[PDB]
Amino acid sequence: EEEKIKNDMLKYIEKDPKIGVWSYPAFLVLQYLYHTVPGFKMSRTAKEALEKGLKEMYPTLFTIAEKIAKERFK
Amino acid sequence: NEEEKIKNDMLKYIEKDPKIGVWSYPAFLVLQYLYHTVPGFKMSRTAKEALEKGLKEMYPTLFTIAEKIAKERFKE
Amino acid sequence: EEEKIKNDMLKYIEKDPKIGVWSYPAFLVLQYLYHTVPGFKMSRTAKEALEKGLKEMYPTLFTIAEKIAKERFK
Amino acid sequence: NEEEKIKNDMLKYIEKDPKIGVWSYPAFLVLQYLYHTVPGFKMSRTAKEALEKGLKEMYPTLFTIAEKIAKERFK
DNA sequence: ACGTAGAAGAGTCTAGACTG
DNA sequence: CAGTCTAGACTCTTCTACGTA
């Protein structure tokens, strides 16, 4: 927990980071925009939404995960 | 048309399964650490909450009308 | 002929049907539609256009490949 | 703008790599049969020819303006 | 500096076998 | 059965190796 969290999450980064949400209101928001604004990418803006909220519910964990993900560029 | 265009559009969706697919390394790692360190964690539940929170913040009017039509259309 | 070509094409059906086209006019039309009509799927209409084009250059060949692709679902 | 709107929208794209990735069993099988049973078969030339043809038949106005700006680009 | 052919791959968006 | 969570066809764009009369 004293920066050990890092290596706990390293076990997970070698697999596809797919998250499957089930919600009527967010699906309706995203789908409505998909059908009214051209070029709308639903799953990228869902990524934006989900990261923004989750970075607010678990700030420390999200910071550590973001660090590991950014330093992952190769 | 009073901007109840939004409700009439969104009603063309209710019959369909509301699955959203997200590809995010940071969010996935946060949810996976939570799932493997707290007992009885529900990953998709927490994902749903984070997504709805952010989506409300980025689209307040859209999400409010969507939440209305979700609670109203699914009460029975 | 004589459905020899049938088994010459069954060799290839185990791989991804990716076809990589580079075409300024086609790309421009597909992108313009992607930015002006909401919900425009660029590559499936590209698929429809390429299948329309072949079905007029190699109608026999396309017919036989189409029978094979349809019956592949089983 | 007087339906020269389309050209203004298109000229915002011209700098890009004009790539198109198609996924279809029938057309893939046909182009592959031709590739293996034709000496020096172009195949991507041919895919481009068929695609441009089909787009012309489907979006003739769009395709004319796009082909106009395409010829215009260099010459 | 390079137009373009193939090849490769991060992502998409729905599907589906599976729990609760 | 409503949601899970991962799997897969398929989307689009980048990448690589390569002759550009």
Resolution of the structure in the document, Å: 3.1
Q: Kind of pairing, strands B19-23 and A18-22?
A: antiparallel
Q: What angle do CA C61, C42, A51 make, to 5 degrees?
A: 135
Q: Do chains A and B touch (3 or more CB pairs under 8 A)?
A: yes
Report the C-alpha gap between D75 and D57 in whole angstroms.
25
In total, chain A counts a number of residues equal to 74
Shortest Cα distance, chain A CAs vs residue C56, angstroms: 31
Nucleotides of E under 7 A from a protein CB: 4-9, 11-16
C16: tokens are: 């991804």
The enclosing H or E element of A34 equals: helix A24-36
Strands C18-22, A18-22: parallel, antiparallel or unpaired by DSSP?
A: unpaired
The answer to whether the CB of A67 falls within 8 A of the CB of B39 is: no
Work out the angle at residue D28's Cα, subtended by the Cα atoms of residues D23 and D29, and round it to the nearest 5 degrees. Answer: 145
- C20 three-state secondary structure: strand
Q: Which residue of C lies nearest to A30 if distances are taken between CA atoms? A: C39
Contact of D31 with C17, CB cutoff 8 Å: no
Instruction: For residue D25, give the nearest of C8, C53, C10 by alpha carbon.
Output: C10
Report residue A38 as tokens.
């051209």
CB D20 within 8 A of CB C53: no
Q: Which 52-71 residues of chain A approach strand E with CB closer than 7 Å?
A: none
DSSP C2-68: TTHHHHHHTTTTTS--EEEEE-HHHHHHHHHHHHHSTT--HHHHHHHHHHHHHHHHSHHHHHHHHHH
Q: Which two tokens stand for residue B24?
A: 């995010």
Angle CA D66–D72–D75, to nearest 5: 150
Residue pair B36/A8 in contact by the 8 Å Cβ criterion: yes
CA angle B45, B46, B52 (to 5 degrees): 90
CB B31 within 8 A of CB B47: yes
CA of A57 to C1' of F19 (A): 56
A26, A71, D64 from D9: Cα distances, Å: 31, 38, 14
**Cα→Cα distances A33→A37, A41, B9, C33, Å:** 6, 9, 10, 17
Could you tell me if A18 and B23 are in contact, meaning their C-beta atoms sit under 8 angstroms apart?
A: yes
In which element (H, E) is residue B23 found? strand B19-23
Residue C51: closest CA among D26, D5, A10:
D26
What's the one-letter identity of residue A55?
K
Contact predicate A25/B66, CB 8 Å: yes
Using the Cβ of B14 and the Cβ atoms of chain A, whether some distance falls under 8 Å is answered with: yes
- Rounded to the nearest 5 degrees, what angle is found at the Cα of D56, between the Cα atoms of D54 and D62? 135
In this complex, is the C-beta atom of B41 within 8 Å of any C-beta atom belonging to chain A?
A: no
Residue of B nearest to A65 (CA): B26
Looking at the DSSP assignment, which residues form a beta bridge with residue B22? A19
Chain breaks after residues in chain A, where C lies over 2.5 Å from next N: none
Contact B41, A68 (CB under 8 A): no
Residues 6+ apart with CB under 8 A from C5: C61, C64, D33, D37
Residue A36 tokens, joined: 């009214």
Q: Does at least one atom of strand E sit less than 7 Å from the CB of B23?
A: yes
Q: Strand pairing of D19-23 and A18-22?
A: unpaired
- Minimal Cα distance from A26: which residue of B? B52
